[PDB]
Amino acid sequence: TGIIMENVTAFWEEGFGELLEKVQSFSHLCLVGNPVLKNINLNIEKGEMLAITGSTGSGKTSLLMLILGELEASEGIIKHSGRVSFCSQFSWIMPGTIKENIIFGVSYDEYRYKSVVKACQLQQDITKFAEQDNTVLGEGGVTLSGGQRARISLARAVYKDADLYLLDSPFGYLDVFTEEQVFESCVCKLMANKTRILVTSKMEHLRKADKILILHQGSSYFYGTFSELQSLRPDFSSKLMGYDTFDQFTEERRSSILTETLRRFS
């Protein structure tokens, strides 16, 4: 499946801020009648990758909830059909082995498993443990690094057979060379033909995306190709492409540069 949004708007409604909270004054935002997103348009073909970036708290997560149906479109048309698979920014971990976490509630299939494991770069993790992917974890799997938890929860989501993959900021940790190999192997090759939406703050991901959506304040700052971006948003581009290794700054620096840049160039 592809995905289409034509001129979609969505309001704060009772309970969405708390959902937002799990997944990453609400009353007043529902009382007053307020768009969390306004005039969103995107059109994404089967098998393409949409990269979503923007300033912090611009509605990135919220756009995924709307896809998931947890937020409601008060206006506009959304089309997409099929199973969706959601990897949240929170990396949840269930009691059981690493392997049991990746296949959680889904049947085991060897070729599929081994291939997901290799492309999420889990082979370098599990090889440090005496029982490898049979190692037992407690929930939160709290002695692992953030990147280890995020790769296991990415592998779980990519292993789900679905028509659309929603991946909310997996690449936000310090082990930055691993993240680059995950993006190239999992998101770019293994998933090359699965429709997919990657929320992100690395410019390489916009560079390889089929489509790009930049959000600011609940609003679409830009939407189209990386090439259209360089030509239609030149102040944004020149500033962002003008660092020499932006993608290796910490997630917080990158997101703060993005926010400031989006603030400057509205």
Of 57, 76, 96, 224, the residue at the interface with ligand ADP (CB under 6 A) is 57
The answer on whether 85 is annotated among ligand-binding residues is: no
Contact 76, 8 (CB under 8 A): yes
Nearer to ligand ADP, 169 or 178 (CB): 169
Of 1, 61, 148, 153, the residue at the interface with ligand ADP (CB under 6 A) is 61
Q: Does 34 bind ligand ADP (CB under 6 A)?
A: no
Contact 241, 203 (CB under 8 A): yes
Collect all residues with Cβ–Cβ distance below 8 Å to 123 and sequence separation of at least 6: 117
- Which 222-241 residues touch ligand ADP, going by CB under 6 A? none
**H or E segment and range at residue 65:** helix 60-68
Q: Does 60 bind ligand ADP (CB under 6 A)?
A: yes
Nearer to ligand ADP, 43 or 217 (CB): 217
The answer on whether 88 is annotated among ligand-binding residues is: no
- The strand pairing partners of 159, in sequence order, are none
Within 10 Å of residue 227's Cβ, how many Cβ atoms?
A: 10
Q: Is residue 91 classed exposed, middle or buried when 0-12, 13-18 and 19+ CB atoms within 10 A define those classes?
A: buried
From 102, 206, 95, 114, select the one nearest 154 (Cα to Cα): 102
The answer on whether 255 is annotated among ligand-binding residues is: no
User: Chain centroid to CA 240: how far?
Assistant: 20
Q: Is residue 154 classed exposed, middle or buried when 0-12, 13-18 and 19+ CB atoms within 10 A define those classes?
A: buried
Of 8, 40, 59, 155, the residue at the interface with ligand ADP (CB under 6 A) is 59
Nearer to ligand ADP, 125 or 218 (CB): 218
Q: Does 84 bind ligand ADP (CB under 6 A)?
A: no
Nearer to ligand ADP, 40 or 98 (CB): 40
- Which 146-205 residues touch ligand ADP, going by CB under 6 A? none
State in angstroms the smallest separation of the CB of 154 from ligand ADP.
18
What gap in Å lies between CA 188 and CA 82, rounded to an integer?
Answer: 21
* Site residue total, ligand ADP (CB under 6 A): 13
- Which 6-25 residues touch ligand ADP, going by CB under 6 A? 17, 20-21, 24
What gap in Å lies between CA 164 and CA 83, rounded to an integer?
Answer: 7
Which residue stretch of 58-66, 68-76, 103-111, 158-166 sits at the interface with ligand ADP (rule: CB under 6 A)? 58-66
Q: Does 58 bind ligand ADP (CB under 6 A)?
A: yes
Collect all residues with Cβ–Cβ distance below 8 Å to 25 and sequence separation of at least 6: none
Site residues (vs ligand ADP, CB under 6 A): 17, 20-21, 24, 36, 54, 56-62
| Residue numbering of the annotated binding site | 12, 54-61, 89
Binding-site residue positions for ATP: 12, 54-61, 89
